[PDB]
């Protein structure tokens, strides 16, 4: 109604628009910090895969339980999610893909076990009733691989004990700065010279494979953090743009109120002067 309150609303929204415009640049800076951490983890995992591939071919007498598939009715999932909000659909599109693939197993009569990383995933399963077997949350923007050891071990022991038949990791892939793709990726069911194998080749394999699965989960967690900052950049850009529309609508209402006040005052001045 009054021209005083409309100015207060315009100022309130303008103050908010200034900080959402700042947060967009902060999200980009954190996205670049995450992209360099993704690149630093690649030279380790590619070498472990190269060693695993050679050893498994050079020693046919042994096949680790991770390298053979058991066709039975129980599955496991590691779900990666954010701790903070302000994401333009990052968790929503991921949970939609998780539910789509989980239903195929529920309908096929198979049981499901869940491992959860991040507070948003924990809140989703806590509210909808998911049977989480292991969970972790409040990890930094720069996570450490030692924090993942526990959650990954619980999921690996269940496969070694024959309780889990297949294990998958659910997270977002960094296609480009404007696109985050939600994906479900399998984990457990993975030149003519030999190494000297100082300790037993079978013992080395039993150790290298555990480091490989942990390195895959760590890379999935670090890449999801880069996707989270990219989703936040877009969300703060949209919030800045929507504030601009609200300021524009209020400015038209303010100008209409400004003109009406001058017209009323002149009507009162002329009316009073005609009576005197």
């Amino acid at each position: 109604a009054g021209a005083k309150e409309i100015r207060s609303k315009i100022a309130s929204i303008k103050s908010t628009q200034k900080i959402t415009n700042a947060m967009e640049k902060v999200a980009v800076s954190k996205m670049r910090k995450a992209q360099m951490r993704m690149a630093a983890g690649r030279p380790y995992a590619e070498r472990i895969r190269q060693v695993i591939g050679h050893l498994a071919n050079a020693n046919p007498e042994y096949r680790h339980p991770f390298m053979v598939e058991r066709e039975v009715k129980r599955v496991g999932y590691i779900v990666v999610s954010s701790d903070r909000g302000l994401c333009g659909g990052l968790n929503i599109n991921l949970f939609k893909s998780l539910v789509k693939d989980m239903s195929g197993y529920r309908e096929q009569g198979a049981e499901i076990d869940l491992c959860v990383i991040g507070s948003k995933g924990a809140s989703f399963f806590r509210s909808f009733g998911g049977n989480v077997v292991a969970a972790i949350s409040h990890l930094g923007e720069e996570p450490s691989i030692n924090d993942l050891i526990g959650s990954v071990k619980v999921m690996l022991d269940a496969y070694l004990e024959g309780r889990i038949d297949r294990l998958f990791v659910v997270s977002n892939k960094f296609v480009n700065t404007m696109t985050q793709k939600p994906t479900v990726e399998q984990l457990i069911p993975l030149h003519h010279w030999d190494y000297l194998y100082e300790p037993d080749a079978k013992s080395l394999l039993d150790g290298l494979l555990v480091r490989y699965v942990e390195s895959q989960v760590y890379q999935a967690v670090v890449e999801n953090n880069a996707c989270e900052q990219a989703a936040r950049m877009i969300a703060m850009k949209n919030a800045t743009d929507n504030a601009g529309e609200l300021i524009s609508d209020l400015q038209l209402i303010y100008n209409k109120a400004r003109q009406a006040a001058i017209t009323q005052e002149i009507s009162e001045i002329v009316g009073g002067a005609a009576a005197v």
Binding site: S12, S15, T16, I19, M23
Partner: protein, 115 residues
Amino acid sequence: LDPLVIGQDHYDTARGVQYVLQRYKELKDIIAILGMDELSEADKLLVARARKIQRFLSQPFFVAEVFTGSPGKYVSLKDTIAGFKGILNGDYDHLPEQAFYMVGGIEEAVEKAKK
């Protein structure tokens, strides 16, 4: 309100309070939309001091006992200056926000916090 009339210590304390309150006014609207946790380390600390200063400005009056129920308080200029300098300098960052509301001198806030 001039250093040549009230001295530099009172003048600086008065301008210090005004600077903190003016900065808090432009942060208040942000907290209502994004929450207190979205702010910087300096802003989080400053907002707590601004809310304490805002409450320490309150005082029970002898003529207002009929409205407040609690007894009136008289606070001298030195006591006033010492209280605001302490809150501005961080001497009470550990006290809760509610300890400064309707108390009188700064020692009454320290005593109210224990209750």
